[PDB]
Amino acid sequence: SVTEKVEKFTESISFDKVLYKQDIMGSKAHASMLAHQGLITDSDKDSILRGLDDIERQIEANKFEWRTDREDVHMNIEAALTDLIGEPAKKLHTARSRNDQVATDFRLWCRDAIDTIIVKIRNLQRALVELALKNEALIVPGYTHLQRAQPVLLPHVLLTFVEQLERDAGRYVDCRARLNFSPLGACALAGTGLPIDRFMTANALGFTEPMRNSIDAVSDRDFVLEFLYTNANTGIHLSRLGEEWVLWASEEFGFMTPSDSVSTGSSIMPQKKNPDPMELVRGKSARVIGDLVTVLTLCKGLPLAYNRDFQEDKEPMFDSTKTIMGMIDVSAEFAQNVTFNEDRIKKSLPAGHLDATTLADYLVKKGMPFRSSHDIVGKLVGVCVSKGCELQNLSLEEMKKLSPVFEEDVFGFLGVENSVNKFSSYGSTGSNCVAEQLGYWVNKLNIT
Amino acid sequence: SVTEKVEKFTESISFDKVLYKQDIMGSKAHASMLAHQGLITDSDKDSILRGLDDIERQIEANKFEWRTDREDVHMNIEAALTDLIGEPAKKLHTARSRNDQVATDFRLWCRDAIDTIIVKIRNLQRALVELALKNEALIVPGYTHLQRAQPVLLPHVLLTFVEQLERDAGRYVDCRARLNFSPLGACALAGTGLPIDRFMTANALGFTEPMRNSIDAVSDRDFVLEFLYTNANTGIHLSRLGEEWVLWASEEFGFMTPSDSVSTGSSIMPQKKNPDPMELVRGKSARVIGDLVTVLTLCKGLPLAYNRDFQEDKEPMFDSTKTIMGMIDVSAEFAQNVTFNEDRIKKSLPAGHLDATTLADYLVKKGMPFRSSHDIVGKLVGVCVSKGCELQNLSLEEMKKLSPVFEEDVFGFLGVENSVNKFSSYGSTGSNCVAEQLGYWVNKLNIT
Amino acid sequence: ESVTEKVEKFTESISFDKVLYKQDIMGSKAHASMLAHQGLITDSDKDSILRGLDDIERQIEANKFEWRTDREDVHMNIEAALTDLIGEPAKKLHTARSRNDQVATDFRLWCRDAIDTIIVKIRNLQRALVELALKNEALIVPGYTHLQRAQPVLLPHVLLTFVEQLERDAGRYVDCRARLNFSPLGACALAGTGLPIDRFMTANALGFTEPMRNSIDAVSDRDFVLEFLYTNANTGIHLSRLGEEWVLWASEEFGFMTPSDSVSTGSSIMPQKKNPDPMELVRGKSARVIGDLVTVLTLCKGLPLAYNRDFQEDKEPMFDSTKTIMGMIDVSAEFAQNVTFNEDRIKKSLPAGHLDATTLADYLVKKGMPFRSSHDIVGKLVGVCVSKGCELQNLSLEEMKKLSPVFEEDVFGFLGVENSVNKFSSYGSTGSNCVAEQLGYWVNKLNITST
Amino acid sequence: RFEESVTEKVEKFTESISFDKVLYKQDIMGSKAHASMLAHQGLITDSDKDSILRGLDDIERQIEANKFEWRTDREDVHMNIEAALTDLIGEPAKKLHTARSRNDQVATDFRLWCRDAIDTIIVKIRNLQRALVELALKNEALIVPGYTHLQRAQPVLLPHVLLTFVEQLERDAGRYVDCRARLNFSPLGACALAGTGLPIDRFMTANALGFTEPMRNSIDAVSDRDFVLEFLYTNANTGIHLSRLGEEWVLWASEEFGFMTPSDSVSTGSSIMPQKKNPDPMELVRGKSARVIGDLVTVLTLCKGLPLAYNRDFQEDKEPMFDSTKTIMGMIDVSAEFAQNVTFNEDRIKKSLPAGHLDATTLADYLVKKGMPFRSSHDIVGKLVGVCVSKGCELQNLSLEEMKKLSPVFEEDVFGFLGVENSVNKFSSYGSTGSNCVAEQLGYWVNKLNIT
Numbered sequence A, B: 001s002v003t004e005k006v007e008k009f010t011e012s013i014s015f016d017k018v019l020y021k022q023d024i025m026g027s028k029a030h031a032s033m034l035a036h037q038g039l040i041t042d043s044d045k046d047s048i049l050r051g052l053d054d055i056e057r058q059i060e061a062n063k064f065e066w067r068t069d070r071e072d073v074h075m076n077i078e079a080a081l082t083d084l085i086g087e088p089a090k091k092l093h094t095a096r097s098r099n100d101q102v103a104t105d106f107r108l109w110c111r112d113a114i115d116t117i118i119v120k121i122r123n124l125q126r127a128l129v130e131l132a133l134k135n136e137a138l139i140v141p142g143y144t145h146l147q148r149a150q151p152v153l154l155p156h157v158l159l160t161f162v163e164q165l166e167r168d169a170g171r172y173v174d175c176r177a178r179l180n181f182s183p184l185g186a187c188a189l190a191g192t193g194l195p196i197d198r199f200m201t202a203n204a205l206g207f208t209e210p211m212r213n214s215i216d217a218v219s220d221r222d223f224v225l226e227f228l229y230t231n232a233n234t235g236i237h238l239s240r241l242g243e244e245w246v247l248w249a250s251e252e253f254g255f256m257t258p259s260d261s262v263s264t265g266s267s268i269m270p271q272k273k274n275p276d277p278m279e280l281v282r283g284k285s286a287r288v289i290g291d292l293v294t295v296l297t298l299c300k301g302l303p304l305a306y307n308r309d310f311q312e313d314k315e316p317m318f319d320s321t322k323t324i325m326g327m328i329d330v331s332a333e334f335a336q337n338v339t340f341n342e343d344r345i346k347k348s349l350p351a352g353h354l355d356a357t358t359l360a361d362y363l364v365k366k367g368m369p370f371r372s373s374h375d376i377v378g379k380l381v382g383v384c385v386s387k388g389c390e391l392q393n394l395s396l397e398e399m400k401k402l403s404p405v406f407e408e409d410v411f412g413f414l415g416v417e418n419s420v421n422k423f424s425s426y427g428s429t430g431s432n433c434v435a436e437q438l439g440y441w442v443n444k445l446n447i448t
Numbered sequence C: 001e002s003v004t005e006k007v008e009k010f011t012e013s014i015s016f017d018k019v020l021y022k023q024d025i026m027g028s029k030a031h032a033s034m035l036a037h038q039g040l041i042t043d044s045d046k047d048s049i050l051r052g053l054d055d056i057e058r059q060i061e062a063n064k065f066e067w068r069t070d071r072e073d074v075h076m077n078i079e080a081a082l083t084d085l086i087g088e089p090a091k092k093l094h095t096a097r098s099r100n101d102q103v104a105t106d107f108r109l110w111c112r113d114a115i116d117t118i119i120v121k122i123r124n125l126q127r128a129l130v131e132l133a134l135k136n137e138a139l140i141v142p143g144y145t146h147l148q149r150a151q152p153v154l155l156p157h158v159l160l161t162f163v164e165q166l167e168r169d170a171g172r173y174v175d176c177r178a179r180l181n182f183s184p185l186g187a188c189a190l191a192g193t194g195l196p197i198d199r200f201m202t203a204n205a206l207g208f209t210e211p212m213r214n215s216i217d218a219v220s221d222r223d224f225v226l227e228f229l230y231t232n233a234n235t236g237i238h239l240s241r242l243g244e245e246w247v248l249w250a251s252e253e254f255g256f257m258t259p260s261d262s263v264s265t266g267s268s269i270m271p272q273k274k275n276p277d278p279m280e281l282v283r284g285k286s287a288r289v290i291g292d293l294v295t296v297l298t299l300c301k302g303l304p305l306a307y308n309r310d311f312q313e314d315k316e317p318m319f320d321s322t323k324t325i326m327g328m329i330d331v332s333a334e335f336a337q338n339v340t341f342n343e344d345r346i347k348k349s350l351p352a353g354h355l356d357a358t359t360l361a362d363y364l365v366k367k368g369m370p371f372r373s374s375h376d377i378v379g380k381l382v383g384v385c386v387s388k389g390c391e392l393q394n395l396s397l398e399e400m401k402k403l404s405p406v407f408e409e410d411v412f413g414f415l416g417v418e419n420s421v422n423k424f425s426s427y428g429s430t431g432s433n434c435v436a437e438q439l440g441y442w443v444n445k446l447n448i449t450s451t
Numbered sequence D: 001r002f003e004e005s006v007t008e009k010v011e012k013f014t015e016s017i018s019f020d021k022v023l024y025k026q027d028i029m030g031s032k033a034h035a036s037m038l039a040h041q042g043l044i045t046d047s048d049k050d051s052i053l054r055g056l057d058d059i060e061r062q063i064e065a066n067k068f069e070w071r072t073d074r075e076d077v078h079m080n081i082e083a084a085l086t087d088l089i090g091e092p093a094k095k096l097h098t099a100r101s102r103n104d105q106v107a108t109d110f111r112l113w114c115r116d117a118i119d120t121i122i123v124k125i126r127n128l129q130r131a132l133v134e135l136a137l138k139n140e141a142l143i144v145p146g147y148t149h150l151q152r153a154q155p156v157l158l159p160h161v162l163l164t165f166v167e168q169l170e171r172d173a174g175r176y177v178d179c180r181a182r183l184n185f186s187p188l189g190a191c192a193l194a195g196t197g198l199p200i201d202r203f204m205t206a207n208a209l210g211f212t213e214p215m216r217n218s219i220d221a222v223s224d225r226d227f228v229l230e231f232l233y234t235n236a237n238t239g240i241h242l243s244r245l246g247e248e249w250v251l252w253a254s255e256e257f258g259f260m261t262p263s264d265s266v267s268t269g270s271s272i273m274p275q276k277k278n279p280d281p282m283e284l285v286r287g288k289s290a291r292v293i294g295d296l297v298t299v300l301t302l303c304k305g306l307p308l309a310y311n312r313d314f315q316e317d318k319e320p321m322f323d324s325t326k327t328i329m330g331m332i333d334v335s336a337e338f339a340q341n342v343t344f345n346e347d348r349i350k351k352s353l354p355a356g357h358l359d360a361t362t363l364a365d366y367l368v369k370k371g372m373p374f375r376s377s378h379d380i381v382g383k384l385v386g387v388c389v390s391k392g393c394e395l396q397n398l399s400l401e402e403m404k405k406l407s408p409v410f411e412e413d414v415f416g417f418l419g420v421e422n423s424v425n426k427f428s429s430y431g432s433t434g435s436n437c438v439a440e441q442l443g444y445w446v447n448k449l450n451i452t
């Protein structure tokens, strides 16, 4: 059947039912306004409000029957309201279109979602900082080109992700403020000649103020694009977190062991511990980017004002949102269920001459042009490579072959533990510098 | 040769040369800080500053030869500097890596770029508001589903774009603030033991403060992602403006005629005026979306800290920025070179029955319920377009046949001029509301 | 709110991968049959397994089968069910197999089945388009460049454009299916096995062309998913253009097309507003199809060998893309059967625009004029007409002779949109006989009849 | 200071010659074929055709010598060439546009360009396949771990890992062949969108330019950019494969894996840390897969929602396709060079292998072949691996006595199945890592690629 095919193709209730709390809040505000403006009676208002709250209790109770033949969340709720309370229900359509209603509902849902995500992000930040604090003294390699470049403190590495998430949080805060303007009162696109008060409904629904352009009100989906992007950049942070942790849990790296409860394995190979949760965090970054491209492509090239294509805005946003929330929480649980392999890590450090840059710094302190200090440290490392020692084990006499500036104080700058203590610049991996940043984060996240 | 081929593939000068002004700025700051902290001499510093000024001047005069064999902008400048001033140039890279250098320069280039784009947008907002003021009384159909729905004022439609562009500006402003933290002094990834000062360079370069984490400073490209997405959303807006204007320019609409300076024609069919620029504006939103996806995919799943993949960050930001600036400026030129065909728009409006919703509002104000009001107007339009006429041509007698609430004042609410006059909600297309909004924008954009 | 509970909910795939049951069961039976043949299980094990899996297929088809999150995925749901049903022999089904080769085999089969279905749906739409074309076979509309009127074309020529697009689409679908039609089964976790399986037998049993040559490729490859997503996306593009065309044609400004009530919405106070929602949504649905492709491109990029758990994310987007494109195709075909063309509106709009100009130029060139002179003379004459308020065909031969003695009485069979269209003659042109030729080709190839 | 008109500001935005000049060779070939058909069909004189064909050859020679000044005020490649042609030969040049439009001209030119680019890419892919097969041949005996979830799963042969990438690239080559065939139809003679009533022969020009046939629909011929989309997609899939190769080799060149050392000619280093070898070229290969995805999204987004027939938006199809093609050629060629400049660290690889119980599965298969069901065989093997973990030993160090406490089926032939070298010897399924299997596959490839 044609109308049956088209019904199935155009219905949105299968997905848009999740807007129910926002829709009800939006309708209550609309009705309160209508009464205050003299377009309905107080009596009709009290009826609408009590009816809407009854339907809400019914949905919370999983006793509400959603219907395809009723199209969407708005008509499903309006039609049930009418069955419950009679004619007053029909008064909700006064000075209102689904165009402006859906925009209101969807912005309200986004606002609540953003709020939830910020709580989740702070939780992940805390989980990372608690892990940093648990391993504050542990030295690991820092990498460029996935080659060992310099020794860093494990907390400094973890604070990288904590700082990335702070930028994410900042985007979410800016996203929320930009979207917190009311489209309600725009009607189908042009506003109304009826005496509504859009300032009153804006305020009732916690919006900053009403949007100043009704065509903009019904045609705008920037708040969707911005939310999707914010989720995509957040997902990227977590994808790099995931790459990192899948590497650290490999045997080649050997740095991290996940608990049984966040890994899988083999009956016949009992040391194999697969970090499936973080591999899925990495992979789920893909869908979040996909969701963003959807709505970008959707909006491209569309004429004004309202077009049915905009119905396609919701499922990507719901997907993106669900996905990031999962990623954030899973990452936090993973952070709480890993331990570092101190002996394996400490064994691996000596062979990399990670203290070379600290030695070059020593020489630069003593007056040597940097390019000369690097050549000389280069040579010394080659000596250590052939002899199979560390720089720390070279004699002062050996160093004096290359320059007279070397003195006995040089040994305070050699070995990884001394190298780490010698970093001193703001934001560096130095012990006191990392200590300060940790204290800053403890205080900001209210950790105790 | 193997060396030939890897050189060509890894070379970045062919594109990163556009960073020259920022690279020189950053190097003057670093040199001044080195000198202040006793890591180089004042005479070294002075030689470096004059040398760099010389090189900048030579670039501006197109007399500087860029070299593939010098890899990138940083080494191209520093080898030239060495050839100009000798040994002092070689101390410039003390306590500095290309890692922290490039991220600093790119950040500065983005700050400059965002500032330029914000100026371009205000110019386009001005061009739109001026177009609106010139055509303040022109009524056109407002559309849903590309079907005529309500009568609206041309200025109200144009203000939709002005409002969209204002959310864009807000995004540029929020993006610039978040990016304005200094990575300089992170060195390769871990910071340094040399007594630099990161606060002093941050101050000299206009950054709010140093970034708090050295690994984050070298590893982060969020600022690229945020600017690319802001460009993309702006381009989405311009793509809709494009779509509208290709439509308006069509014979089928006949709403607008572009000047010959902004259109192509045909000697055999002299009435064919193609709006090539706006078609290109809509089409160029695609490249800006592609640029965003490039760099999202770039960052996805990369380990810490610096990887050579991050060299791919620059060409997409350059392409996106240049495209959007071109799209903003040609859209303003176009806005300044279009005329509306008032006689043709006027003759099309009557047969719509666009006054129908206004008549319905008239009845709701008289105390009719929503559905009843629609039922009545329903009937009235049949009795009307059965005689190929307009509602305002009906007699009061035939109106009172359908309901007694009709009175003589009803004619004040029929026809599109009256319909437009009767919209009264904030942000509506109503004559007074639109004048209020035009006054707001005239003040905000310092128009005279 | 336990970790095990949180991780279970995040890693479970049964909520979406249950749709592979048919192919999963078909694979497992081919597996068990090969095992028995090769002596790795008894024939009574095989018979016991085939019976059980049929019982389970019936239970699923009857909505009597309880899918379980604690059983993770389709593979483990089914096999745990098989164990509860037949006991010991079910346990032997895992012999010389991994979920790695198993999942790749199942998904390949599902994709081959999905592609066969899409091709049929495309033939349908092609048929609906050619039938609409034949029903409106003599109708003339403007052809557009830059959304400006360029030349007069036959509506059938325009609809055949979309039929030709869809024909390239069907072509990609066939090539895609051919490349994916190689068996991963028997790669095990990634390295293969030392057990005496026969990969040729299972490949043949499952309709695959031959076994894949590399065990590691077999578990790690998702190209078939990428290529099918891309092919859906390009089909989606074509339908988005169709969507945009028809949303314009149903505008009042164009006024070329009226959709039936069954494929439109409207307004009780504005009875002439007819919103073509299905086509707007077809247009809009092309976006999620592009998004699903980007998802899987980004998923695969930069991943090491061989199998990785990120690959679990390949399914939901392929399922979304496939369901979306099938709906887009089916609804377009339905809309093509529920539209009529507003003949008098079209005819009224045509003659202001001078679409016959190029035909008059072609007339002058055949009479010997150089092409540059011909375009200048016709531009001038169209100037005379714009001024006078007329069509070229209403000018007298005396007015044309003012501009060139070349014009003769025969010129009049070259003017007007009906004459214009009859005079196109290049292959693939909008010419009357050309479109007829092309319509015969599609009537033949799609087996269109009048009964 | 020269004050610019509006017309000048707009010309800068809409000019395409800055990028489309790279089509000159296709454009001149298309125009020559056009003129030849014109003369044959009587629409121009043979004298006029000869002048046109000679002027176009001269112009092509001037471009090849870098004596040709491209001009932004001539808009595009088509107009640059034809106005230059008019300046050279005068009036005959003006007959060139008889029965042709830029709409059908550009579509012909870009198809010719794309057909040549695919032909070049196929060659470059065969080269990379050969480089990979020779690296495999030179390292045929070397055993390395095979990973799932970046955890050691099984022992495999290095050649079998490299043949994964050869098999990938063979699918890529198939898509290029299929893509080229589908795009090899001539739009020429569609004119602006509707054809023409002049007596052209579209089959003649199609054959002259190596197309299979003229396209069956004039509107489709000027509106279609499927060939572009399909090429971009094919590039992007190829780029994903090269991104996995990049990821692999960056990991392998790490200290932690320590499997592979690149030559100095394909890596970068550090004077202070002379042992640090960065695989920058393979990092960039991985990175450049991104822009190839971006270029596909560009033209996908571009085509979405556009009405028929030709729109000016379509000029945005050239730059992505040029970028995509250049990038993928670079990634393929550099990958082939990197493959020819790596060596494997045989002692480093070998020292890691023996402690991961990589032989456990091969013991499980031994038990299945002796008649134990799958589930009991894994029970037994998990228990024996359990004893090795505790005793800090390998499986091949267990006694036949200890094993017989779990199951009678154990006999002395069990030790032919244990240890990493035996494990790899025991794989035997078609397409498996067994050495006889891989040998058969290498011979297939050596023959297929005509390696001598």
Ligand SMILES: N/C(=N\CCC[C@H](N)C(=O)O)N[C@@H](CC(=O)O)C(=O)O
Pocket: A012, A072, A097, A098, A099, A102, A188, A306, A308, A310, A311, A312, B144, B145, B149, C265, C266, C275
């Ligand atoms: N119903 C409607 N828009 C529905 C918005 C809700 C929709 N499910 C969505 O998600 O966009 N608009 C009216 C009014 C109008 O568009 O003029 C109509 O289609 O007639």
Ligand SMILES: N/C(=N\CCC[C@H](N)C(=O)O)N[C@@H](CC(=O)O)C(=O)O
Pocket: A264, A265, A274, C013, C073, C098, C099, C100, C103, C189, C307, C309, C311, C312, C313, D148, D149, D153
């Ligand atoms: N679980 C697994 N493959 C799962 C394939 C199906 C999965 N639901 C998906 O969707 O990819 N493989 C084994 C074997 C292995 O990877 O070594 C494992 O991870 O332990």
Ligand SMILES: NC(=[NH2+])NCCC[C@H](N)C(=O)O
Pocket: B012, B072, B098, B099, B102, B308, B310, B311, B312
């Ligand atoms: N360690 C280094 N030399 N890093 C190189 C940084 C500059 C490089 N051209 C880029 O764009 O990222």
Ligand SMILES: NC(=[NH2+])NCCC[C@H](N)C(=O)O
Pocket: D016, D076, D102, D103, D106, D312, D314, D315, D316
């Ligand atoms: N009507 C025309 N002159 N069309 C121009 C076609 C060539 C154009 N530069 C493109 O790349 O699409």
Ligand SMILES: O=C(O)/C=C/C(=O)O
Pocket: B266, B269, B272, C145, C146, C149, C150, C151, C358, D101, D102, D103, D192, D310
């Ligand atoms: O070249 C075009 O876009 C249009 C041609 C025409 O008017 O025939």
Ligand SMILES: [Cl-]
Pocket: A185, A196, A197, A198, A199, B424, B425, B426
């Ligand atoms: Cl108000």
Ligand SMILES: [Cl-]
Pocket: none
């Ligand atoms: Cl100071």
Ligand SMILES: [Cl-]
Pocket: A424, A425, A426, B185, B196, B197, B198, B199
């Ligand atoms: Cl500092």
Ligand SMILES: [Cl-]
Pocket: C425, C426, C427, D189, D200, D201, D202, D203
């Ligand atoms: Cl022909």
Ligand SMILES: [Cl-]
Pocket: C186, C197, C198, C199, C200, D428, D429, D430
């Ligand atoms: Cl086999």
